[PDB]
Scaffold this active site. Structure first.
Site, mmCIF file in Angstrom:
data_model
loop_
_atom_site.group_PDB
_atom_site.id
_atom_site.type_symbol
_atom_site.label_atom_id
_atom_site.label_comp_id
_atom_site.label_asym_id
_atom_site.label_seq_id
_atom_site.Cartn_x
_atom_site.Cartn_y
_atom_site.Cartn_z
ATOM 1 N N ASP A 57 16.806 47.121 -28.348
ATOM 2 C CA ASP A 57 17.700 45.983 -28.616
ATOM 3 C C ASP A 57 19.105 46.420 -28.971
ATOM 4 O O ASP A 57 19.399 46.799 -30.150
ATOM 5 C CB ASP A 57 17.125 45.203 -29.766
ATOM 6 C CG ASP A 57 17.932 43.945 -30.120
ATOM 7 O OD1 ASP A 57 17.808 43.452 -31.265
ATOM 8 O OD2 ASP A 57 18.715 43.467 -29.300
ATOM 9 N N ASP A 81 23.848 42.862 -24.502
ATOM 10 C CA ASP A 81 22.689 42.761 -25.421
ATOM 11 C C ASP A 81 21.369 42.816 -24.671
ATOM 12 O O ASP A 81 20.891 41.792 -24.173
ATOM 13 C CB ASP A 81 22.801 41.442 -26.202
ATOM 14 C CG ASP A 81 21.652 41.218 -27.175
ATOM 15 O OD1 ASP A 81 20.697 42.068 -27.252
ATOM 16 O OD2 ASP A 81 21.696 40.168 -27.881
HETATM 17 C C1 LIG Z 1 16.901 36.350 -28.457
HETATM 18 C C2 LIG Z 1 17.239 37.197 -29.646
HETATM 19 O O1 LIG Z 1 17.609 36.705 -30.709
HETATM 20 N N1 LIG Z 1 17.130 38.514 -29.481
HETATM 21 C C3 LIG Z 1 17.301 39.444 -30.570
HETATM 22 C C4 LIG Z 1 16.190 40.458 -30.489
HETATM 23 C C5 LIG Z 1 14.883 39.651 -30.557
HETATM 24 C C6 LIG Z 1 13.955 39.748 -29.514
HETATM 25 C C7 LIG Z 1 12.782 38.998 -29.574
HETATM 26 F F1 LIG Z 1 11.751 39.062 -28.558
HETATM 27 C C8 LIG Z 1 12.539 38.137 -30.642
HETATM 28 C C9 LIG Z 1 13.466 38.032 -31.678
HETATM 29 F F2 LIG Z 1 13.103 37.089 -32.783
HETATM 30 C C10 LIG Z 1 14.642 38.802 -31.637
HETATM 31 C C11 LIG Z 1 18.650 40.080 -30.398
HETATM 32 O O2 LIG Z 1 18.904 40.924 -31.513
HETATM 33 C C12 LIG Z 1 19.799 39.093 -30.307
HETATM 34 N N2 LIG Z 1 21.036 39.809 -30.574
HETATM 35 C C13 LIG Z 1 22.124 38.967 -31.123
HETATM 36 C C14 LIG Z 1 21.953 38.548 -32.552
HETATM 37 C C15 LIG Z 1 21.566 39.405 -33.547
HETATM 38 C C16 LIG Z 1 21.443 38.741 -34.784
HETATM 39 C C17 LIG Z 1 21.041 39.449 -36.045
HETATM 40 C C18 LIG Z 1 22.143 40.105 -36.837
HETATM 41 C C19 LIG Z 1 22.791 41.184 -35.970
HETATM 42 C C20 LIG Z 1 23.110 39.047 -37.345
HETATM 43 C C21 LIG Z 1 21.573 40.731 -38.114
HETATM 44 C C22 LIG Z 1 21.684 37.375 -34.713
HETATM 45 S S1 LIG Z 1 22.073 36.923 -33.087
HETATM 46 C C23 LIG Z 1 23.578 39.122 -30.659
HETATM 47 C C24 LIG Z 1 22.757 37.902 -30.214
#
Ligand SMILES: CC(=O)N[C@@H](Cc1cc(F)cc(F)c1)[C@H](O)CNC1(c2cc(CC(C)(C)C)cs2)CC1
Length: 372
Positions: A35, A221
């Site tokens: 990720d 991402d």
């Molecule tokens: C769909 C999703 O959200 N994917 C997760 C990975 C993921 C995959 C999955 F299968 C299930 C999940 F619950 C999460 C991924 O980090 C998204 N990256 C971003 C964000 C990160 C954050 C967290 C911070 C960085 C603020 C602490 C908020 S939005 C930039 C958009």
């Protein structure tokens, strides 16, 4: 840089790509989602309906408690748990072991996925966005500080050529792409933030103020499936994509990303869906390059031939997600504050059109395209 990591990724469509890791002594094997859109390394550390295994701290001779809790809220899902440090390695990886920060996940909500086969997540973006705060050193940062591994990794995500791909830690593997790598600056080290200076659909400039494409940011991402576009940009793209494909007509739930559309097996009308070109800021002044996405990337197949529209509305800026990265080899050159794109060796097929990384292009006032 090197053969051992080629094809070390797997996954299911729309549920991310994962790589095999082991944590603790003796080594416990977990599948870990890769990720670049977050910066925490975290793992199932307790039963869950959707986990087939999980990290057992008490079974690890090398575990240390950090006596501090953590939580991370993603777009939809979230988990909380306990911070520790343990010894970590990637079996089909470089030949090393590091002590890294790990969030032992105790509770979660809409995080683990039923289909899944992965039990944790490897946040590869920078310390700035790490929880609980920037003093929690990310996994890639520790692997670099602790070994001789160069500060660079590359992702070749393939799209069903049950998905697969490679994560080359430590370098670039010239066997995974053709043509030239083209590089765009990492604008600031937090997410993998970049600047989109121009957008064309079937060769027509969207003609927006280039600030709109980066409003409030554009990132690369691998943990987000779709191409996610700011509201004004999303509206303009769906407008042209509708008009290019107007020969046929679709439910509204389709353009909203909700309900699938179907055609008779082998008859999906690819030619009526346009190509999308994203122009990225280049390395030299007034110079950019373009990646071209084909409809085969943004019409993601769900199990007749059936698909969801894999572009979605954002209120947090542009997200270049897994579907954009598929069929490109994407180099995260942290050491040089840049990200490189090349046509991947698992490139997406059309009988008449190809995904491309092309340059150079001249583009004036690219500085003006950044938001704030
Ligand atoms: C769909 C999703 O959200 N994917 C997760 C990975 C993921 C995959 C999955 F299968 C299930 C999940 F619950 C999460 C991924 O980090 C998204 N990256 C971003 C964000 C990160 C954050 C967290 C911070 C960085 C603020 C602490 C908020 S939005 C930039 C958009």
């Amino acid at each position: 840089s090197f053969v051992e990591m080629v094809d070390n990724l797997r996954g299911k469509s729309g549920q991310g790509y994962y790589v095999e890791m082991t944590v603790g002594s003796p080594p416990q094997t977990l599948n870990i989602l890769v990720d670049t859109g977050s910066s925490n390394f975290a793992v199932g550390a307790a039963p869950h309906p959707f986990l087939h295994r999980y990290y057992q701290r008490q079974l690890s001779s090398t575990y240390r408690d950090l006596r501090k809790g953590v939580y991370v809220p993603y777009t939809q899902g979230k988990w909380e748990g306990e911070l520790g440090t343990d010894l970590v390695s990637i079996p089909h990886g470089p030949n090393v072991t590091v002590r890294a920060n790990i969030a032992a996940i105790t509770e979660s909500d809409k995080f683990f996925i039923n289909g899944s086969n992965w039990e944790g997540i490897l946040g590869l973006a920078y310390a700035e966005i790490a929880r609980p705060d920037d003093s929690l050193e990310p996994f890639f940062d520790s692997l670099v500080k602790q070994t001789h591994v160069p500060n660079l990794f590359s992702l070749q995500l393939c799209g069903a050529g049950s998905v697969g791909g490679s994560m080359i830690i430590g370098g670039i593997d010239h066997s995974l792409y053709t043509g030239s790598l083209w590089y765009t600056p990492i604008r600031r080290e937090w997410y993998y933030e970049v600047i989109i200076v121009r957008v064309e659909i079937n060769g027509q400039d969207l003609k927006m103020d280039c600030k709109e494409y980066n409003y409030d940011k554009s990132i690369v991402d691998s943990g987000t499936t779709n191409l996610r576009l700011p509201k004004k940009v999303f509206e303009a793209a769906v407008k042209s994509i509708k008009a290019a494909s107007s020969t046929e007509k679709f439910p509204d739930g389709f353009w909203l990303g909700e309900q699938l559309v179907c055609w008779q097996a082998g008859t999906t009308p690819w030619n009526i869906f346009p190509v999308i070109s994203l122009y990225l800021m280049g390395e030299v002044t007034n110079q950019s390059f373009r990646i071209t996405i084909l409809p085969q990337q943004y019409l993601r197949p769900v199990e007749d031939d059936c698909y969801k529209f894999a572009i979605s509305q954002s209120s947090t800026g542009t997200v270049m997600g897994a579907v954009i990265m598929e069929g490109f080899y994407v180099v995260f050159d942290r050491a040089r504050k840049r990200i490189g794109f090349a046509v991947s060796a698992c490139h997406v097929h059309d009988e008449f059109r190809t995904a491309a990384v092309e340059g150079p292009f001249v583009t004036l006032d690219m500085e003006d395209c950044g938001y704030n």
